[PDB]
């Protein structure tokens, strides 16, 4: 699954980041980062899901999560 995050896409991301050249070793180093990012956020949102005794992670659970990770997001109510 993490491999589903393709080089083409990782490349696209870099590009928006203003990156002109990329060392091959970057795609894997990148996924690890993305994995850790999601784990942190998802762990927190799902915790909110349990506290609310639901089996569905809601956009708000994520929003709250992000807020906690110090990464406020706009466009979903939080």
């Amino acid at each position: 699954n993490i491999q589903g995050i393709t080089k083409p896409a990782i490349r696209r991301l870099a590009r928006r980041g203003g990156v002109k050249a990329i060392s091959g070793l970057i795609y894997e180093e990148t996924r690890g980062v993305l994995k850790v990012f999601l784990e942190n956020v998802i762990r927190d949102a799902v915790t909110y899901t349990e506290h609310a005794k639901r089996k569905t992670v809601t956009a708000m659970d994520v929003v709250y999560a992000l807020k906690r990770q110090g990464r406020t997001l706009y466009g979903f109510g939080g």
Binding site: R71, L73, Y74, G75
Partner: protein
């Protein structure tokens, strides 16, 4: 007549007051705090919309969208700072390429 009207505001003085109480921020709430706050919120709302509205104009467009709000915010020192830890969905990024990355002559 409503308090927003007495205050000359477009924002819901009453609602703000209500939300402040439901906030559990303090045991009591001054009569004017809801007013003052409503005032501040409206203002900043106006502040952005203005810039975002200009953003749309420059883009030859008339309906504001995330990208216009992103351009509005990151393009203004203050707003950009006030929202420095905030991420706007579908906003993109300010066009920018490190000089040293451009070809010679």
């Amino acid at each position: 007549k409503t308090r927003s009207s007495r205050a000359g505001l477009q924002f819901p003085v009453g609602r703000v007051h209500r939300l402040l109480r439901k906030g559990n921020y303090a045991e009591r709430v001054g009569a004017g705090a809801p007013v003052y706050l409503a005032a501040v919120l409206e203002y900043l709302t106006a502040e952005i919309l203005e810039l975002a509205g200009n953003a749309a104009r420059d883009n030859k467009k008339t309906r504001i969208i995330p990208r216009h709000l992103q351009l509005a915010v990151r393009n203004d020192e203050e707003l950009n700072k006030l929202l420095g830890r905030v991420t706007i969905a579908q906003g993109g990024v300010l066009p920018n390429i490190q000089s040293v990355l451009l070809p010679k002559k």
